[PDB]
């Protein structure tokens, strides 16, 4: 059986799908279907400090040369008339309690994407928010203190995770996407999951940061690249932060003394080797090469079926 449900379970996937299905049960909409959430890749990675920051802070011993993290890919599926549809995906980076500062106990969203066929329409955004809030709830429980989001929509015609979106799925502009994150985070605050959140500039100001070495350094993020582009010739950094403040969310999960003397992060879930889902490139390539598209409900369901066969058959022993 090559179903979504039959993909191996994880504590995280179970936590998220239980949150979503409980939410759906509360809404009691006759058209909602069972949601399945699965983590389909988890691996150890490191992010190397680029040359320039390496020459400036690493070679002096002020900063680590690299930061270890775990990457996880997760997907959500909904049953519609008994057929599974993959409608949401996310790649995250998790920096544990053993990781050197400035990255310890932080999570970062690498990529998030969706295809707009969730049934019913009126619960789609709500379910996306339930997944995101659930993710923050879960990592807070593990002892991660801070979440980080670069709220940047894809460029015209580009796909983050799913190949060939529906032509009529509008892509939000920056302001709309920013507001979307504020709505999600305001809900999380009301549920006492998030303590508070700040834009990157306000965060740096309140922290009284005085050196670029203090800013969290994530794989593929804007800030390592802008630090390199700036270094070609700290006040620059502050200026760049103010200019792009509204794009970058810093989400405080644990505050005050509660954040001070935490035990180590222990993740109960094992690594999950899966080359197909090691970052976003391999799945886009599979979809492109096999002429799969997520461009209509029926096409998306077909492509979901094909994705599932490949996930199961890559995983077999
Ligand atoms: C390297 C570099 O330089 N740069 C980058 C840096 C990478 C950063 C990566 N960061 C991340 O991944 C985190 S930010 C997440 C960004 N991901 C995406 O945006 C993927 C494409 N978008 C989506 O999947 C969805 O829009 C989603 C974000 C899931 C929200 O779906 P939704 O449905 O809840 O809300 P809605 O979409 O606002 O729609 C809600 C309503 O708004 C409507 N709507 C949406 N957009 C528009 C619009 N443009 N104009 C008018 N209306 C509009 C939509 O029709 C709808 O109407 P209704 O409810 O009446 O039907 C790089 N690495 O390449
Ligand atoms: Br509907
Ligand atoms: Br609607
Ligand atoms: Br909580
Ligand atoms: Br592959």
Swiss-Prot record:
Top-rank taxon: Eukaryota
Function of the molecule: Functions as a histone acetyltransferase and regulates transcription via chromatin remodeling. Acetylates all four core histones in nucleosomes. Histone acetylation gives an epigenetic tag for transcriptional activation. Mediates acetylation of histone H3 at 'Lys-122' (H3K122ac), a modification that localizes at the surface of the histone octamer and stimulates transcription, possibly by promoting nucleosome instability. Mediates acetylation of histone H3 at 'Lys-18' and 'Lys-27' (H3K18ac and H3K27ac, respectively).
Disease tied to this entry: Defects in EP300 may play a role in epithelial cancer. Chromosomal aberrations involving EP300 may be a cause of acute myeloid leukemias. Translocation t(8;22)(p11;q13) with KAT6A.
Post-translational changes noted in the entry: Acetylated on Lys at up to 17 positions by intermolecular autocatalysis.
Segments of this protein annotated with the region Interaction with histone: 111-113
Variant or mutagenesis effect after changing residue 71 to R: 40% decrease in activity. 90% decrease in activity
Effect of substituting residue 303 to Y: In a pancreatic cancer sample
N6-acetyllysine: modified positions: 50, 187, 213, 236
Domain annotation CBP/p300-type HAT: ranges: 1-316
Quaternary organization: Interacts with HIF1A; the interaction is stimulated in response to hypoxia and inhibited by CITED2. Probably part of a complex with HIF1A and CREBBP. Interacts (via N-terminus) with TFAP2A (via N-terminus); the interaction requires CITED2. Interacts (via CH1 domain) with CITED2 (via C-terminus). Interacts with CITED1 (unphosphorylated form preferentially and via C-terminus). Interacts with ESR1; the interaction is estrogen-dependent and enhanced by CITED1. Interacts with HIPK2.
Protein name: Histone acetyltransferase p300
Annotated positions binding acetyl-CoA: 112-114, 124-125, 171, 176, 180
Annotated effect of mutating residue 110 to W: Loss of activity
Subcellular location: Cytoplasm; Nucleus; Chromosome
Domain notes: The CRD1 domain (cell cycle regulatory domain 1) mediates transcriptional repression of a subset of p300 responsive genes; it can be de-repressed by CDKN1A/p21WAF1 at least at some promoters. It contains sumoylation and acetylation sites and the same lysine residues may be targeted for the respective modifications. It is proposed that deacetylation by SIRT1 allows sumoylation leading to suppressed activity.
């Amino acid at each position: 059986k090559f179903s979504a449900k039959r993909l191996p379970s994880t504590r995280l996937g179970t936590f998220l799908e239980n949150r979503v299905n409980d939410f759906l049960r509360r809404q009691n909409h006759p058209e909602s279907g069972e949601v399945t959430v699965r983590v389909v890749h988890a691996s150890d990675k490191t992010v190397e400090v680029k040359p320039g920051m390496k020459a400036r802070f690493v070679d002096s011993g002020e900063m680590a040369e690299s930061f270890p993290y775990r990457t996880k890919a997760l997907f959500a599926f909904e049953e519609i008339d008994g057929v599974d549809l993959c409608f949401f995906g996310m790649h995250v980076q998790e920096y544990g309690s053993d990781c050197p500062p400035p990255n310890q106990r932080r999570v970062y969203i690498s990529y998030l994407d969706s295809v707009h066929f969730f049934r019913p329409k009126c619960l789609r955004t709500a379910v996306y928010h339930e997944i995101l809030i659930g993710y923050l709830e879960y990592v807070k429980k593990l002892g991660y203190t801070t979440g980080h989001i670069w709220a940047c929509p894809p460029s015209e015609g580009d796909d983050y995770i799913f190949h060939c979106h529906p032509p009529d799925q509008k892509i939000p502009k920056p302001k709309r996407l920013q507001e979307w994150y504020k709505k999600m985070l305001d809900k999380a605050v009301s549920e006492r999951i998030v303590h508070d959140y700040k834009d990157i500039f306000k965060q740096a100001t309140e922290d009284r940061l005085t050196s670029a070495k203090e800013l969290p350094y994530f794989e593929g993020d804007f800030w390592p690249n802008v630090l390199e582009e700036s270094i070609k010739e700290s006040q620059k950094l502050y200026a760049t932060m103010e200019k792009h403040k509204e794009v970058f969310f810093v989400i405080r999960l644990i505050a005050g003394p509660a954040a001070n003397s935490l035990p180590p992060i222990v993740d109960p879930d094992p690594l999950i080797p899966c080359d197909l889902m090691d970052g976003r490139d391999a799945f886009l390539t599979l979809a492109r090469d096999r002429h799969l598209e997520f461009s209509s409900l029926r096409r998306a369901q077909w492509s979901t079926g094909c994705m599932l066969v490949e996930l199961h058959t890559q995983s077999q022993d």
